Amino acid sequence: ADGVGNASGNWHCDSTWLGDRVITTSTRTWALPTYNNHLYKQISSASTGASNDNHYFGYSTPWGYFDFNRFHCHFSPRDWQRLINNNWGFRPKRLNFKLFNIQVKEVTTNDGVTTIANNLTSTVQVFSDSEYQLPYVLGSAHQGCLPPFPADVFMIPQYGYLTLNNGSQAVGRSSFYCLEYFPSQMLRTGNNFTFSYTFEEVPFHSSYAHSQSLDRLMNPLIDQYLYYLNRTQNQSGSAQNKDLLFSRGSPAGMSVQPKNWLPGPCYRQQRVSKTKTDNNNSNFTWTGASKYNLNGRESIINPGTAMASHKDDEDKFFPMSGVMIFGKESAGASNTALDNVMITDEEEIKATNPVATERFGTVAVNFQSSSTDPATGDVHAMGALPGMVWQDRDVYLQGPIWAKIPHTDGHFHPSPLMGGFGLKNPPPQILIKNTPVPANPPAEFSATKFASFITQYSTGQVSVEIEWELQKENSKRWNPEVQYTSNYAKSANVDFTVDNNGLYTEPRPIGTRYLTRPL
Amino acid sequence: ADGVGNASGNWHCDSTWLGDRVITTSTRTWALPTYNNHLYKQISSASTGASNDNHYFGYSTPWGYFDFNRFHCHFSPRDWQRLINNNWGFRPKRLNFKLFNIQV
Amino acid sequence: ADGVGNASGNWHCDSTWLGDRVITTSTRTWALPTYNNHLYKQISSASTGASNDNHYFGYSTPWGYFDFNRFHCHFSPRDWQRLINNNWGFRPKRLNFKLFNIQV
Amino acid sequence: ADGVGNASGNWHCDSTWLGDRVITTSTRTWALPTYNNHLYKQISSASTGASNDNHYFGYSTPWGYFDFNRFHCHFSPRDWQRLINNNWGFRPKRLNFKLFNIQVKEVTTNDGVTTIANNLTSTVQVFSDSEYQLPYVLGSAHQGCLPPFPADVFMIPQYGYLTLNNGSQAVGRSSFYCLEYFPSQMLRTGNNFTFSYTFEEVPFHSSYAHSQSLDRLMNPLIDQYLYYLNRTQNQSGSAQNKDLLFSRGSPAGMSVQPKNWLPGPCYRQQRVSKTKTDNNNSNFTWTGASKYNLNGRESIINPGTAMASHKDDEDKFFPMSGVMIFGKESAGASNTALDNVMITDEEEIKATNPVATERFGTVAVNFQSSSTDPATGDVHAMGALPGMVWQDRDVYLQGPIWAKIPHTDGHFHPSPLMGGFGLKNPPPQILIKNTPVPANPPAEFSATKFASFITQYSTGQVSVEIEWELQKENSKRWNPEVQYTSNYAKSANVDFTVDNNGLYTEPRPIGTRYLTRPL
């Protein structure tokens, strides 16, 4: 508790590298409006003309929420470079969150003159949902996270959620949540808020590419002792006669050579070229999409199973729904051109992972015999097989960090498909609201609910501190690695900087996979 | 006692079920007008044309009062469901009341 | 060990709800015939005209066996209601089995 | 635990008078059949042609139950005489119950030859319902109690109960109870059963009559200092003129004299003569009955409010539904003659209690004036008024002892209307059943329930021990009391004895009220 004239916190944006730990700290200044005029609202797809696939039922809330779940909320571009060039992995360890220097301001409008003044006795309400009792809205990759650039002031997003829906209607099993029915701390201008959080144990994200591929793991100099069936008919000179001929795995035959392992799972997606003229002329984004069917309602699979974006020298192709796509600062919200988006490239994992736009392989579909020819078929979707190995999708400086693992009877490899760390108990949602301040009530009692309030909003600073654990690179590789680097040549701007108007931009996505490891 | 810039209380709305006890807590925000221009007034049914059965004599007061005496002031609908489906009875035991974050 | 005239056990059918535990107890009366005239028998699908999908080979035994593996062996309908309306989950913990009051 | 050849208990029938306590002990021999072929059955008034007032829904049970709730189960006639001649009151204190010397017998029938043999390995099941979790069937005055005469062997009655009914149907709120879903002790022929019980604190039953009446409590020699309005018109000689004249209460005026107390509550019932020729010619037992209306279903009030059976020298009249009526041993079940029943007489309580067949009194029904005459009306039913005093109904040697007070939000003077001690926690129901013994099962498994059992039944001895507390008579009365006595004159039989065929009979009801007390 502080008075009116004492600051309740200090600005801390820093990055500290010690041993196998790096600690990031970021401070931003925020602004919180009143949402929904202090009301909870039933929201629905009703009377929107929505397709069956787009129906929803839910509620909008008066509350806002803090979202720091993206990597540029924490690492600067230089810091991200230090991470990805020097480290085979990393994971989050613990978390510290602070709200301070609260200012609540009332807004008065007379004629066209808006006047803003301090309201020193008003409060804001803050609580974290530590027991995960609310619908968890983080991890859907929503905008409204802390800005990448520390000098930018950001608006706090409005909290809302969805429940079970049949069309645009609800079901008796649908849940409604009042956030005023949790406890929350109330803060005047001298108060501050804090809590800490510990990440559970998670695997290090793999920041590296394999320097080998699954099908190349053999000694190139040595034969095997295993035999395979090489030929079902002998050549002779006269005519082809049925025969059974066997060869042992040799270096000339690496493709037919027996192996211990299989590539990872595959769900095939449509291939689309970054050159317009190569693609079919039609709108196939929905009709040609890889989709799943849930309760008679289709949803595009995206980004889907972790798969290589393209094979060698096909770089102009990308999976239609299968890659993370970031917008530039010049991108519009809908139907923006290719030059305004940044399409990530998952190419590093083609060592262990199927290419996203190709079949997993071929299977025998029949019994051959002297009468009937052997037939095969393509496998476009392949589930887990014993012996499969795969890499998870890479993360990105502007991509998400964690997702909440759904609470369910069963999981298979619960790594979030957009990338990052799947968490049973993720960092909790932090909810904030301006406390309603009634206007002058009438002189005689009325039992009707107050609709009349003093217009106000709030602003302050927020700090997030995350400790990260690093996995060091042990390699015996003789030759130099690939590194992320900035271009040394001259240019009009510097990457990851403001322009002459003050606009901070991010030139490109930066993944984590540069250093290499044997497979 | 707090200053101008310090909150004097926190929002608490909760329901805790422990053993044979349930504890309800509810927080609301209120607004208090000035009543009667700070005056006490004799009030009556006089000159109302009231029937004999409706006559009254009394006073209106400048004061307001807090009334929490209804069950939905305390139990949410879900909480009320937990009570009535699982229990043969219940009674109130103790009470705690707080006013805070005053703004005039 | 008891004599001819002493009961070797008491009837216990009950359900006890304590905290996060519920303990079910069920007592039934059973009858055991002699099976197969005390013989083991090779049994097979042979000479049954069975389809290939229905073939089998095995043995029938003179023995009987106790099977309590169903939920109504334990929970009454009311008890099942208490479970499913109030609880997000449940699992079995430990088991106790008794045979008594044998009459041949 | 005993073997086959050892008795598990001894015969105890005794009465011990010590100080202010009397302890009764009674042993009887019982026989328990198999009921319902080991089945629970839904029972209903459906297809009985029942009137709406007689509909019911319920269940019959395989179990039997022990009922000792009558006074002759405990007191001999001589013991009852000692109680009622010497004591102003008494109440039950504690209870001891024992089952022992169990014999289970199997019955085999071939041709017309029934053969009975011991089954030494069979059991009976016994439990008391201590937590009152079953519908409490005691206290409805059912037959099947221990016989009055210790040498009589009695059959155990079958347990059954009713639940909510709409007509002959049930309601989703109706309860079904399986008695096998309680724990119970299983008893072979060497086993025995016991438990003890403590009565709660209850008032002494009042065994006495008042030697005064409410309206006679004044000093007959002395005037009052209070005045009453004696006359509203003066006599003069010429004509009656309006006047207000006041007199003070005197001994000549005891009826108009101010008093502190009122007689007890009244619900009037129809008067019927023990001489046929006096009564109206019609069947008025239902149409002229005092009845209550519960859920659109009528029930005769009986015996109803405690009231005097008749006034002075009207002894030939009795309340139609308002007295306890016992049958003689020669009585049939339905439409038996007056000579086969014994009608109790509640006459002793006319000191404080209204006569059952008369109005409670008169009330002013209007405003009198010079124009309109004062009018009154009769009060045939009067609820509790402040200042009322009353006596409860008397008990009887062959009448009931206790009833269970219904578990409800409210009560008014919860004394059972048939007489005796109202108990929140009465002596528990004691339930007994022969354990089913399957016959030979088939040689191949069937999942169908066994319908085939060895026919058997059981027999044994039961002991009940009750300690009673006595309230001694303190009277200063000079002249001799009324006492219960046997007639000294010769006769063909002795009262309360067996006849030459061995049939024990009870010549008459014996109440408790002989000694007197001032009011």
Coordinates of N, CA and C in Angstrom, one line a residue, chain A residues 191-263:
Chain A
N191 N -2.1 0.9 -4.6 CA -2.0 -0.6 -4.5 C -1.3 -1.2 -5.7
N192 N -0.7 -2.4 -5.4 CA -0.1 -3.2 -6.5 C -0.5 -4.6 -6.3
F193 N -0.3 -5.4 -7.4 CA -0.6 -6.8 -7.5 C 0.5 -7.6 -7.9
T194 N 0.7 -8.8 -7.3 CA 1.7 -9.7 -7.8 C 1.3 -11.2 -7.5
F195 N 1.9 -12.1 -8.3 CA 1.9 -13.5 -7.9 C 3.0 -14.2 -8.7
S196 N 3.4 -15.4 -8.2 CA 4.4 -16.1 -8.9 C 3.9 -17.5 -9.3
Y197 N 4.6 -18.1 -10.2 CA 4.1 -19.4 -10.8 C 5.3 -20.2 -11.1
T198 N 5.2 -21.5 -11.0 CA 6.2 -22.5 -11.3 C 5.7 -23.4 -12.5
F199 N 6.5 -23.4 -13.6 CA 6.2 -24.4 -14.6 C 6.4 -25.8 -14.1
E200 N 5.6 -26.7 -14.6 CA 5.9 -28.1 -14.4 C 7.0 -28.6 -15.2
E201 N 7.5 -29.8 -15.0 CA 8.6 -30.4 -15.8 C 8.1 -30.7 -17.2
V202 N 8.8 -30.1 -18.2 CA 8.5 -30.4 -19.6 C 9.7 -30.7 -20.3
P203 N 9.6 -31.4 -21.4 CA 10.8 -31.6 -22.3 C 11.4 -30.3 -22.8
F204 N 12.7 -30.2 -22.9 CA 13.3 -29.1 -23.7 C 12.7 -29.1 -25.1
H205 N 12.3 -27.9 -25.5 CA 12.0 -27.8 -26.9 C 13.3 -28.0 -27.7
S206 N 13.2 -28.7 -28.8 CA 14.4 -29.1 -29.5 C 14.8 -28.0 -30.5
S207 N 15.8 -27.2 -30.2 CA 16.3 -26.2 -31.1 C 17.6 -26.8 -31.7
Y208 N 17.4 -27.4 -32.9 CA 18.5 -28.0 -33.6 C 17.8 -28.7 -34.8
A209 N 18.6 -29.0 -35.8 CA 18.2 -29.9 -36.8 C 19.0 -31.1 -36.8
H210 N 18.5 -32.3 -37.3 CA 19.3 -33.4 -37.3 C 20.3 -33.3 -38.5
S211 N 21.5 -33.7 -38.3 CA 22.6 -33.8 -39.3 C 22.5 -35.1 -40.1
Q212 N 21.6 -36.0 -39.7 CA 21.3 -37.2 -40.4 C 19.8 -37.4 -40.7
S213 N 19.5 -38.2 -41.6 CA 18.1 -38.6 -41.9 C 17.9 -40.1 -41.6
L214 N 16.7 -40.4 -41.2 CA 16.4 -41.8 -40.8 C 16.8 -42.8 -41.7
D215 N 16.7 -42.6 -43.0 CA 17.0 -43.7 -44.0 C 18.4 -43.7 -44.3
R216 N 19.3 -42.8 -43.8 CA 20.7 -42.8 -44.1 C 21.5 -43.2 -42.8
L217 N 21.0 -43.8 -41.8 CA 21.7 -44.1 -40.6 C 22.8 -45.2 -40.7
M218 N 22.8 -45.9 -41.8 CA 23.7 -47.1 -41.9 C 25.2 -46.6 -42.2
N219 N 26.1 -47.6 -42.0 CA 27.5 -47.4 -42.4 C 27.5 -47.5 -43.9
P220 N 28.0 -46.5 -44.6 CA 28.0 -46.6 -46.1 C 29.1 -47.5 -46.7
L221 N 30.0 -48.0 -45.8 CA 31.1 -48.8 -46.3 C 30.8 -50.3 -46.2
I222 N 29.8 -50.8 -45.5 CA 29.8 -52.2 -45.1 C 28.4 -52.8 -45.5
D223 N 28.5 -54.0 -45.9 CA 27.2 -54.8 -46.2 C 26.5 -55.2 -44.9
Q224 N 25.3 -55.5 -45.1 CA 24.5 -56.1 -44.0 C 24.7 -57.6 -44.0
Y225 N 24.3 -58.3 -42.9 CA 24.1 -59.7 -42.9 C 22.6 -60.1 -43.2
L226 N 21.7 -59.2 -43.4 CA 20.4 -59.5 -43.7 C 20.1 -59.5 -45.2
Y227 N 19.2 -60.4 -45.6 CA 18.9 -60.5 -47.0 C 17.4 -60.1 -47.2
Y228 N 17.2 -59.5 -48.4 CA 15.9 -59.1 -48.8 C 15.6 -59.8 -50.2
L229 N 14.3 -59.9 -50.5 CA 14.0 -60.4 -51.8 C 14.2 -59.4 -52.9
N230 N 15.2 -59.6 -53.7 CA 15.5 -58.7 -54.8 C 14.7 -58.8 -56.0
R231 N 14.5 -60.0 -56.5 CA 13.8 -60.2 -57.8 C 12.9 -61.3 -57.7
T232 N 11.7 -61.1 -58.3 CA 10.7 -62.2 -58.4 C 10.7 -62.9 -59.8
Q233 N 11.5 -62.4 -60.8 CA 11.8 -63.1 -62.0 C 13.2 -62.9 -62.4
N234 N 13.8 -64.0 -62.9 CA 15.2 -63.9 -63.4 C 15.2 -63.3 -64.8
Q235 N 16.4 -62.8 -65.1 CA 16.6 -62.1 -66.4 C 16.8 -63.1 -67.5
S236 N 17.7 -64.1 -67.3 CA 18.3 -65.0 -68.3 C 18.6 -64.2 -69.5
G237 N 18.5 -64.8 -70.7 CA 18.4 -64.0 -71.9 C 17.1 -64.2 -72.7
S238 N 16.4 -65.3 -72.6 CA 15.4 -65.6 -73.5 C 14.0 -65.0 -73.1
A239 N 13.6 -65.2 -71.8 CA 12.3 -64.7 -71.4 C 12.3 -64.7 -69.9
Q240 N 11.4 -63.9 -69.3 CA 11.3 -63.7 -67.9 C 10.6 -64.9 -67.3
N241 N 11.3 -65.7 -66.4 CA 10.8 -66.8 -65.7 C 10.6 -66.4 -64.2
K242 N 9.6 -67.0 -63.6 CA 9.4 -66.8 -62.2 C 10.6 -67.3 -61.4
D243 N 11.0 -66.5 -60.4 CA 12.2 -66.9 -59.6 C 12.1 -66.2 -58.3
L244 N 12.9 -66.7 -57.3 CA 13.0 -66.0 -56.0 C 14.5 -65.8 -55.8
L245 N 15.0 -64.6 -55.8 CA 16.4 -64.2 -55.7 C 16.5 -63.2 -54.6
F246 N 17.6 -63.4 -53.8 CA 17.8 -62.7 -52.6 C 19.2 -62.0 -52.6
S247 N 19.2 -60.8 -52.1 CA 20.4 -60.0 -52.0 C 20.5 -59.5 -50.6
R248 N 21.8 -59.3 -50.1 CA 22.0 -58.8 -48.8 C 22.1 -57.2 -48.9
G249 N 21.7 -56.5 -47.9 CA 21.8 -55.1 -47.9 C 23.2 -54.6 -48.2
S250 N 23.3 -53.8 -49.2 CA 24.6 -53.2 -49.5 C 24.6 -51.7 -49.6
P251 N 25.7 -51.0 -49.7 CA 25.7 -49.6 -49.8 C 25.1 -49.1 -51.1
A252 N 25.1 -49.9 -52.2 CA 24.5 -49.4 -53.4 C 22.9 -49.4 -53.3
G253 N 22.4 -50.2 -52.3 CA 21.0 -50.4 -52.2 C 20.3 -49.8 -51.0
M254 N 20.8 -48.6 -50.5 CA 20.3 -48.1 -49.3 C 18.8 -48.0 -49.2
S255 N 18.1 -47.9 -50.3 CA 16.6 -47.7 -50.2 C 15.9 -49.1 -49.9
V256 N 16.5 -50.2 -50.3 CA 15.9 -51.5 -50.1 C 16.5 -52.2 -48.8
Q257 N 17.3 -51.5 -48.0 CA 18.0 -52.0 -46.9 C 17.1 -52.0 -45.7
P258 N 17.1 -53.2 -45.0 CA 16.3 -53.3 -43.7 C 16.7 -52.2 -42.7
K259 N 15.7 -51.7 -42.0 CA 15.9 -50.6 -41.0 C 15.1 -50.8 -39.8
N260 N 15.5 -50.1 -38.7 CA 14.8 -50.3 -37.4 C 13.7 -49.3 -37.2
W261 N 13.5 -48.2 -38.0 CA 12.7 -47.1 -37.6 C 11.8 -46.7 -38.7
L262 N 10.7 -46.0 -38.4 CA 9.8 -45.4 -39.3 C 9.7 -43.9 -39.1
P263 N 9.3 -43.2 -40.2 CA 9.1 -41.8 -40.1 C 7.8 -41.6 -39.3

